[PDB]
């Protein structure tokens, strides 16, 4: 039993404790596990729930303590398809409008994300003094085309992440005069158009609207992005 053996044995003991620690740290969200009816599950696993920690959020936004009582804080328009557990829950209405499945959105705070100085992180370029397109194709003015190869509108502005100097949304003007935001990660900027494969032209108007023309809240971002991503599954019939 030399020093090397003692070292490799000590390390494996240390590693087991590290894993136990890492796994509990990754249980501060979504636990305790629930049954499909919302009640707590009997089998919660061999790892206990971690003890609460507290983050102090900047800009007087309060404090978050995790773990804590969980809540969706929104209705879920789904229904069981089987007595036993493990089967899909089927939408009871329009999943895109009800925000379920790939169209899901989380009930985040109805507030905009802020930068280090307390200003809105995301802003339309028309309201961002000094910002411009420096490389690539400028999409402003281009027609926006859906997966049905119809035009839904034209790009009128870009919403930029100012601290990161990055384009995050295209503001698209619809045929009826209003506008919507399109995630930058879900569009294709081409030479003569912007193509959105996730939605059909007649589904742009259904994108959730923002309540202020110069800012977007975390809740609105989740609703907008969820709706667009949900189009990949629920707008497939009109995809040419």
Partner 1 sequence: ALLSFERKYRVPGGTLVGGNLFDFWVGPFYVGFFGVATFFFAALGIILIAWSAVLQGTWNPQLISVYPPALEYGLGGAPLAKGGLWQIITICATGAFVSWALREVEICRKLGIGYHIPFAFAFAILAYLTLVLFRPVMMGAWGYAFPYGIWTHLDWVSNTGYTYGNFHYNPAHMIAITFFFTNALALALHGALVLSAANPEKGKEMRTPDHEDTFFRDLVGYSIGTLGIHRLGLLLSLSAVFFSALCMIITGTIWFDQWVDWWQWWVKLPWWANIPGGING
Partner 2 sequence: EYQNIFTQVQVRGPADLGMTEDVNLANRSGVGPFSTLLGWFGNAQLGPIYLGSLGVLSLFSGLMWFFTIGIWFWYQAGWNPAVFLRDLFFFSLEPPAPEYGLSFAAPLKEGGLWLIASFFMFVAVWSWWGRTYLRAQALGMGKHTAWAFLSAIWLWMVLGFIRPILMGSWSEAVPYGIFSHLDWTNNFSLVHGNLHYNPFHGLSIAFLYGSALLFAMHGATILAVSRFGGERELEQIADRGTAAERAALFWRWTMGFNATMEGIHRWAIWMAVLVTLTGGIGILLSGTVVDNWYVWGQNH
| Chain residues in the site for partner 1 (CB under 8 A) | 29-36, 41, 43-44, 55-58, 70-72, 76, 78, 81, 86-91, 95, 99-104, 106, 114-117, 163-164, 166, 226, 229-230, 232-233
Indicate whether 10 belongs to the interface with ligand LDA (CB under 6 A).
yes
Q: What is the DSSP letter of 210?
A: P
Task: From 10-18, 60-68, 157-165, 210-218, give the range in contact with ligand LDA by CB under 6 A.
Answer: 10-18
Q: ∠ CA 209-142-201 to the nearest 5 degrees?
A: 50
User: From the CB of 171, what's the least distance to partner 2, in Å?
Assistant: 13
Q: What is the DSSP letter of 40?
A: B
Examine residue 236 and say whether the peptide bond preceding it is cis (omega within 30 degrees of 0): no
User: From the CB of 27, what's the least distance to ligand LDA, in Å?
Assistant: 7
Q: How far apart are CA 74 and CA 100, in angstroms?
A: 11
On whether the CB atoms of residues 181 and 170 are closer than 8 A, the answer is: yes
Identify residues 105-164 at the interface with partner 2 (CB under 8 A): 105-106, 108-109, 113, 116, 125, 128-139, 158, 160, 162-164
User: From the CB of 135, what's the least distance to partner 2, in Å?
Assistant: 4
List, in order, residues 6 or more apart from 205 with CB less than 8 Å away: 174, 176, 178, 180
Q: What is the DSSP letter of 30?
A: S
- Site size for ligand LDA, by CB under 6 A? 14
| Among the listed residues 221, 231, 234, 235, the single contact to partner 2 using CB under 8 A | 221
Examine residue 4 and say whether the peptide bond preceding it is cis (omega within 30 degrees of 0): no
Q: How far apart are CA 129 and CA 131, in angstroms?
A: 6
Report phi then psi at 20, rounded to 5.
-55, -40
Site residues, partner 2 (CB under 8 A): 2-5, 7-8, 11, 18, 22-23, 25-30, 55, 57, 61, 64, 104-106, 108-109, 113, 116, 125, 128-139, 158, 160, 162-168, 183-189, 197-198, 218, 221-222, 225-226, 228-229
Question: Which stretches of the chain bind ligand LDA, using CB under 6 A?
Answer: 6-7, 10-11, 13-14, 16-19, 21, 23, 45, 47
């Amino acid at each position: 039993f030399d020093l090397a053996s003692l070292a490799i044995y000590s390390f494996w003991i240390f590693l087991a404790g590290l894993i136990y620690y890492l796994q509990t740290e990754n249980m501060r969200e979504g636990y305790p596990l629930e049954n499909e009816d919302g009640t707590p599950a009997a089998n919660q696993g061999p790892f206990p729930l971690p003890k609460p920690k507290t983050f102090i959020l900047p800009h007087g936004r309060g404090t978050l303590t995790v773990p804590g009582p969980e809540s969706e804080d929104r209705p879920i328009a789904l229904a069981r398809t089987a007595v036993s557990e493990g089967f899909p829950h089927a939408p009871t209405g329009d999943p895109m409008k009800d925000g379920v499945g790939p169209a899901s959105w989380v009930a985040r705070r109805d507030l905009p994300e802020l930068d280090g100085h307390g200003h809105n992180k995301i802003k339309p370029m028309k309201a961002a003094a000094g910002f411009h397109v420096s490389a690539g194709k400028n999409p402003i003015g281009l027609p926006v085309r859906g997966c049905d190869l119809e035009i839904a509108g034209k790009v009128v502005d870009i919403w930029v992440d100012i601290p990161e100097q990055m384009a995050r949304f295209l503001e698209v003007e619809l045929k009826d005069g209003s506008t919507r935001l399109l995630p930058m990660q879900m569009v294709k900027v081409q030479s003569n158009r912007v193509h959105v494969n996730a939605l059909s032209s007649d589904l742009f108007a259904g994108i959730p609207t923002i309540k202020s023309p110069t800012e977007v809240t975390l809740l609105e971002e989740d609703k907008i992005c969820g709706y667009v991503a949900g189009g990949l599954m629920y707008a497939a019939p009109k995809r040419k």
